[PDB]
Design a protein around this nucleic acid. Structure first.
Lengths: 144, 258
RNA sequence: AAAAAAAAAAA
RNA sequence: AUCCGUAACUUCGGGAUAAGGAUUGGCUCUAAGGGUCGGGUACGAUCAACUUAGAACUGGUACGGACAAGGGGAAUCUGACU
RNA sequence: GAAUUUGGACAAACUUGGUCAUUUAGAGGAACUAAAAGUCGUAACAAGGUUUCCGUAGGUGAACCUGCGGAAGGAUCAUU
RNA sequence: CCGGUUGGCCGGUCGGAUUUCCAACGGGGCCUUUCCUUCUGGCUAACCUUGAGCUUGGCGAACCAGGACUUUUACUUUGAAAAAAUUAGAGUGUUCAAAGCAGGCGUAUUGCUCGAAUAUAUUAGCAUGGAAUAAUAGAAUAGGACGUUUGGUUCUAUUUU
RNA sequence: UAUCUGGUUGAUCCUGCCAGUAGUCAUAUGCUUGUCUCAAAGAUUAAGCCAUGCAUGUCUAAGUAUAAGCAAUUUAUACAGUGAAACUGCGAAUGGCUCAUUAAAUCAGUUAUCGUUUAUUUGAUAGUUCCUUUACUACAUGGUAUAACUGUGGUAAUUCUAGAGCUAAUACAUGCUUAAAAUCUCGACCCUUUGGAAGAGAUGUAUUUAUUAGAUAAAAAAUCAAUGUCUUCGGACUCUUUGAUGAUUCAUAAUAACUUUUCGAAUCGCAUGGCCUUGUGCUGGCGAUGGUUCAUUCAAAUUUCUGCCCUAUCAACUUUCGAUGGUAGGAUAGUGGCCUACCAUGGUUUCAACGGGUAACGGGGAAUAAGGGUUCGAUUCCGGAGAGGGAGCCUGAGAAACG
């Protein structure tokens, strides 16, 4: 987050096929395209107002959430538009008739819509392969 | 591998064909068509193992080559055409008309019918869409594409069809208290007059149904199939009428009528 | 309250 | 000279430029690395240097082009070393 | 429109070294086990004839000796 | 209060079943200070709705639609799903049995007909009821909850003019 | 079918092990062997080598037939029966065999493609293509090869072949023929102000880019910039059209152009019939084949979540030259560090990473069991991988193909 001087890179980052005619003068200083990914998830005013682009965002980016809806807590947010979360769980070993703790560290893509910290509980929704490891995207946060 | 497969072994097909584990290692792989492979009667089996009108696929080839048989009013001179649910067969010789449906055991039954019943059939819509040039069309479970329907028709409805043309004569919508038939699962073969469904936005709309004897169960909208309203169906049913008796009362009935 | 070592194995 | 790779042993400091290999010209380009000034109580203008990395093109596979500039390794006797 | 051709990516295979892993010889050395009516003694089991044992250090042909500290599995459950 | 399963005379049928019954057994609802999420709609539902003993007119879920919202799990019940073959297992003549999924019944002259079940199939994942057990969160430098109210700020906007 | 026994001792009670016992679709072997049924079988060591011979070829009424082949039609003088060879189209990527590799890889169950390709099927589905498109044209329909075969030869030999002479197509290869209307553009000219015009061209589908619609919980008023529907020009105003998904830049449609320009039937059999202004006039059936797009089916590729044996005498691994991520682009059928350029410094790990080993393909399942469990599973089914080891590639829908 932190609004990051949006046009920092070399390419011009914009929403594709969103053409704001300069000939017409209006309010709505720029056209911003967004959506609602269903499942009761609230696309925030921060997304609909902000200037960030994020091709990979589910709200303003040309992707689509489908499949699994998981939950975790954040343990590493050192990357750009990406984080890692720890999905703890138990696992039954029948011989002893009891369990053992386990985990998975899962990398997930985050949008600039959300500001997040380590320890923040979140939920995530599966997307298509974003990268070599990221098959998910952030959809809601549940702490401060 | 390296492409499709075109064989099929015994012990690999469905159990509902009732092919013996003996009699060679193989079984007939259905060719392509409207109906999925895991639910398809095809003709060789329908004739040889159910009806006993033939002993060998050679005899069956002779039959289809002399063009006795048709399906949906079409000859279909292929040994392994996929014959699926609701599927009407007509043998001009013997003036016989069957309609592929299931029994309580999930098995394709031998449901002899009349010609007026052969002259139509039902189709569960699998989608509606806009073809090229603003044309609306639909697609059923039996692969049929159909144009310019009633806009009131939406998904998961059933459509009564002319069977000479591929035109729609009528349709039934999806609502509580509608007569159903099952296509797939542990509860296959039953009929139970829907009580209510549940949405589960994100996948697998479910539905609760209760048979005439108040025996309730739950199934998936992929498996369900609507045929009419409370009481009246739009078609002829076989014996049993989708009740799913228990084995105890079943053997009791056998002992009564032995 | 000097000294006083060893005895094939088997049962 | 740049890059890579570096054994035994060891007083853990070294051995070690270990060993052992690749590259190196010219020309045309690119990139990065700086100073001084300007702002009610994010920048812009100007100035000037040598260093490093990279890409094309080229040549009778040549390029630390002359000069200059270590041969190395395994072991022993011996004296610890300068 | 064939032969042929420039450059590029894929890159088999070979040459040389580098490393890892598995077996394999090796003068000689130092252990272990077994057999043996061998030699030297008799360290241990009784207060085993210096009570045994532990750790440690040194020594000696060999068991083993001795010094310091400890233990009792001691030969003392004990001196109002 | 309601109604289900066992019972129990009765056997009012000829060793099968009823209904009014003493009891137990499990379920649902109501009140006891007990919201046990509601906003907009319609069936208005069961309706003060009463027309003379079956009629003209109560409260939205019991029927859906969409909405604001909506503490998290674990566990457990049920359900689906867990390919067949195999496994246990029902029926059935392989002459028994292993086997197999066939077979049986007639006036056998024309034909009739039962079938080929069922159960388990870890764990993970899906849906559902429960809500004990074990954890988790909440309102304490109250930036806290309700809210008929009272200004206001911002946002969006159909119907019409 | 929840069972124990012998052995340390002079004898005793314990620990504890050795041996014994039972079974094994677990193998080998010795001895023996008369019957019925069913039936595994070069996996273990050498995924080591292989003689020979077989294992994928294929036609109908319905692609091409002067066989200088067979027959006789006798309905036939173009053919018209059968029919080798050869062209063409399909298939040969299925199946079958083995388990060498492979330890989050395979695989199982479970998701997804709003992230993609798909022969064949099945059902639907092109009136728009004459290009100065008023002689430019065959549209009762356009052209060229070339096999097979004739004959000449080469070779020691191969499923080797050349030159020379013909000939066909659903082979190659161009190319026409059908509405009408409506909307746009330009636009002659009449000219007006209210301003209107004749005429020309364009308008299928496919590919590419760009742009637009693809929606909406509720009710009324104030005027205007211009009058818009028609007027009793006061202003009556309605009519207005919008599907799906949980959700899209979805589907679909529309404008502007683009394309070396796709597709839109020069095909075949049987029946041969109706109308007449009786011409080889105009119409006309049942099929096979072929084709764009969509859907379906057969699938395929990637993919979510959870789970795998032994080892710490492997504790730190990855990142030079791709490791984790971001942006853009190339490539892909398509997502994506899959690859490239630039940038940031991240990613995994005592919940055992990384590494090593396996006498390890994984499962479904097998043996043995009171229960719990242990051991096994190359092997009759599913999924993978491989064709002596590696890499590469044409063909095709489909192969990194191995008959």
């Amino acid at each position: 987050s932190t609004e990051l001087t949006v046009q920092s890179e070399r390419a011009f980052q914009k929403q594709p096929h969103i053409f704001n005619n300069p000939k017409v003068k209006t309010s709505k200083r720029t056209k911003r395209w967004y959506k609602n990914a269903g499942l009761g998830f609230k696309t925030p005013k921060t997304a609909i107002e902000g200037s960030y682009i994020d091709k990979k965002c589910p709200f303003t980016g040309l992707v689509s959430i489908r499949g699994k809806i998981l939950t975790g807590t954040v343990v590493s947010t050192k990357m750009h538009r990406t984080i890692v979360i720890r999905r703890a769980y138990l696992h039954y070993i029948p011989k002893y008739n009891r369990y053992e703790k386990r985990h998975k560290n899962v990398p997930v893509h985050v949008s600039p819509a959300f500001r997040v910290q380590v320890g923040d509980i979140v939920t995530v929704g599966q997307c298509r392969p974003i990268s070599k490891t990221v098959r998910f995207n952030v959809v809601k946060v549940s702490a401060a | 591998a390296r492409g499709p497969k075109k064989h099929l072994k015994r012990l690999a097909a469905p159990h509902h064909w009732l092919l013996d584990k003996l009699s060679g290692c193989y079984a007939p792989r259905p060719s392509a068509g409207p109906h999925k492979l895991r639910e398809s009667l095809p003709l060789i089996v329908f004739l040889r193992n159910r009806l006993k009108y033939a002993l060998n696929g050679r005899e069956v080839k002779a039959i289809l080559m002399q063009r006795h048989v048709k399906v949906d009013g079409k000859v279909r001179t292929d040994t392994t055409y996929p014959a699926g649910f609701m599927d009407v067969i007509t043998l001009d010789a013997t003036n016989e008309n069957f309609r592929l449906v299931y029994d309580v055991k999930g098995r394709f039954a031998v449901h002899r019918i009349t010609d007026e019943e052969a002259s139509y059939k039902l189709g569960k819509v699998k989608k509606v869409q806009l073809g090229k040039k603003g044309v609306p069309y639909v697609v059923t479970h039996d692969g049929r594409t159909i144009r310019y329907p009633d806009p009131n028709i939406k998904v998961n409805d059933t459509v009564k069809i002319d069977l000479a043309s591929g035109k729609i004569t009528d349709f039934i919508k999806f609502d509580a208290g509608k007569l159903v038939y099952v296509t797939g699962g542990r509860n296959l073969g039953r009929i139970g007059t829907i009580v209510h469904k549940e949405r589960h936005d994100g996948g697998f709309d479910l539905v609760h149904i209760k048979d005439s004897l108040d025996n309730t169960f739950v199934t998936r909208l992929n498996n369900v199939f609507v045929i009419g309203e409370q009481g009246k169906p739009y078609i002829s049913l076989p014996k049993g009428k989708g009740i799913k008796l228990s084995i105890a009362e079943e053997r009791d009935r056998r002992r009564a009528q032995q």
